[PDB]
Design a protein around this ligand. Structure first.
Ligand code: JBG
Ligand code: ZN
Ligand code: ZN
Length: 451
């Protein structure tokens, strides 16, 4: 009876630096390779010191988000890793520009930096692309992927080694939004399921209500003579927000005086690359792209930097990064926090150790990048558009697949415990169904015996 080993080097009882080691029949597989946004230097990396890079046969990347691929240029260029790397086409294309904005936004010189834009550029040739619903075989390992929804190109990988099927969700959503599909429920049933836990103890409101709340907050800020800050990286959930705002400005002629800026040095390139992968979007937006392209915004202007910005009267700025560690969104927050008329809207999952996470604990004051202290008077709102499955969607996914083993990753420690308990209760009195739920810490291993 062969022994299957699953070990989180990252995202074990936390959100950040997703990296999961899978060991079975003389094969070593790594799932994702992200950084931790709430940490600095070598500490922001997964616990890579616990493995030998040269022994990794396969490296699979779920989606282009920094907490899943941010460490990838360091692992590909600055380690003994000689294995093969796979991404979907849209993920590889977006990976090149989000990481370029990331290195730009970053506040350190080449000495302290994990990698450069040249390392990122060079890492590209080392990455192979896979289509959805297509089998690839590497070192005896058979793999294919499903749609994850969540972000453009996001995949759920199914891995088969000697009759043993394992499904890794990456990050996923089971609802369609304006341009993305929902995640697929595989019909092939896995022995092991590795699933994200981000919003697993919560229940989503209607898309219509979240969109209305968001738009009403923005409108309320500009009405009172304020400027709206919406921190986001140029590629990710930002594309959904741009679609919502552009539609809202069309429906409200009394806002045609108020400008909307999508502020990023790479703004034009980001949108051009995004639009190249329309084939990976919803059926709705795929049919309408040649009728009226909604990605060709009527009310949103690009903005390269603070230098190209006339901060005269109310405006709405979408600026990188999302967690406001440094860069344009941090610069604008420092210029706008002291006026009570201004407002910040946080739309993503904020990780401990970031300004975005900090400002939600309602501080009296904040620290600038220069080191100074400023009073926090501007409003701070949290309206999530992070596109993660809620309890009903997680439960429904587990119930359709009924895998003997469920492994929780990518979630706050205490909420992951609560999710585990609820999944255990769901199958406690069921005699015909048997499911074992695990929630390992970083460096802890899940050991399973097969055959
Ligand atoms: C080793 N160090 C180097 C220095 N860095 C600074 C850059 O840190 C980051 C990182 Cl790594 C990732 C994100 C991110 O994934 N962001 C998404 C989602 C989102 C979140 C919140 C709100 C809205 C959206 C988006 O912007 O789409 C981010 O925002 C910041 Cl600030 C830390 C690691
Ligand atoms: Zn994600
Ligand atoms: Zn994630």
């Amino acid at each position: 009876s062969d022994q299957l080993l699953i070990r989180p080097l990252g995202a074990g009882q936390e959100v950040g630096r997703s990296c999961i080691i899978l060991e079975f029949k003389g094969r070593k597989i790594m799932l994702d390779c992200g950084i931790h946004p709430g940490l600095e230097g070598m500490d922001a990396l997964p616990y890579i010191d616990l493995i030998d890079p040269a022994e990794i046969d396969l490296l699979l990347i779920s989606h282009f988000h920094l907490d899943h691929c941010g460490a990838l240029p360091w692992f590909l260029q600055k380690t003994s890793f000689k294995g093969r790397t796979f991404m979907t086409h849209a993920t590889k294309a977006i990976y090149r520009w989000l990481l370029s904005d990331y290195v730009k936004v970053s506040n350190i010189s080449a000495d302290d930096m994990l990698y450069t834009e040249t390392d990122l550029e060079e890492s590209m040739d080392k990455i192979e692309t896979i289509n959805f619903h297509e089998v690839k075989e590497v070192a005896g390992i058979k793999f294919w992927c499903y749609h994850a929804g969540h972000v453009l190109g996001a995949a759920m990988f199914m891995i088969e080694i000697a009759g043993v099927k394992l499904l890794y969700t990456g990050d996923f959503s089971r609802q369609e939004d304006r341009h993305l599909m929902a995640a697929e429920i595989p019909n092939i049933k896995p022995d092991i399921l590795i699933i994200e836990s981000t919003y697993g103890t919560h229940i989503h409101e209607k898309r219509e209500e979240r969109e209305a709340r968001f738009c009403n907050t923005v409108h309320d800020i500009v009405n009172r003579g304020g400027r709206g800050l919406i921190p986001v990286f140029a590629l990710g959930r930002a594309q959904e927000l741009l679609l919502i705002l552009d539609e809202y400005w069309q429906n409200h002629p009394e806002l045609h005086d108020i400008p909307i800026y999508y502020a990023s040095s790479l703004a034009k390139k980001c949108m051009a690359v995004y639009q190249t992968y329309v084939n990976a979007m919803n059926d709705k937006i795929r049919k309408q792209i040649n009728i009226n392209n909604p990605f060709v915004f009527k009310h949103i202007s690009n903005l390269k930097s603070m230098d190209h910005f006339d901060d005269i009267g109310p405006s709405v700025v979408m600026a990188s990064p999302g967690m406001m560690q440094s860069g344009l969104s941090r610069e604008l927050f420092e210029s706008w926090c002291t006026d009570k008329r201004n407002g910040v809207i946080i739309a993503g999952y904020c990780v401990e150790g970031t300004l975005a996470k900090h400002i939600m604990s309602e501080p009296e004051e904040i620290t600038t990048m220069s080191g100074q202290k400023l009073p926090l008077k501007m409003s701070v709102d949290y309206i999530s558009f992070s596109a993660h499955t809620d309890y009903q969607q997680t439960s429904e996914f587990i119930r359709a697949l009924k895998p003997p083993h469920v492994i929780l990753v990518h979630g706050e420690q205490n909420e992951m415990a609560r999710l585990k308990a609820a999944l255990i209760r769901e199958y406690e009195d069921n005699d015909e169904v048997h499911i074992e739920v695990h929630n390992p810490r970083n460096t802890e291993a899940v050991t399973l015996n097969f055959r």
